[PDB]
């Protein structure tokens, strides 16, 4: 719960929730690259093309 000053213009609150965002890149063979993305208490729900 945030309490902020009034302001006449529309405003946003930007909250950063600091996590570990780690990529572990493995290239095991010529012309191949692989990666695994861990993200901790706000895991990626996406995995889009």
């Amino acid at each position: 719960n945030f309490e902020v000053d009034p302001m006449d213009e529309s405003t946003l609150l930007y909250v950063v929730f600091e996590v570990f965002d780690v990529v572990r890149v493995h290239q095991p063979h010529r012309g191949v690259i692989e990666a695994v993305y861990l993200r901790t208490p706000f895991s990626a729900g996406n995995a889009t093309t």
Binding site: T11, V23, V25, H26
Partner: protein, 50 residues
């Protein structure tokens, strides 16, 4: 104001190193215990709440 793009090239710069030294490095980094790992400087979930 307007912009237009005429030609975008990609540039790359390669360290000259001896071929025998180079291939030894490659063979070491194709092991699965020698996997590179990186992290974002600001690792965060970025939320905007009106």
């Amino acid at each position: 104001a307007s912009i237009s793009f005429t030609s975008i090239n990609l540039y790359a710069t390669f360290f000259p190193m001896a071929h025998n030294t180079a291939s030894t490095l490659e063979a070491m980094l194709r092991n699965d215990t020698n996997d590179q790992s990186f992290n974002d400087y600001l690792s965060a979930a970025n939320m905007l709440y009106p």
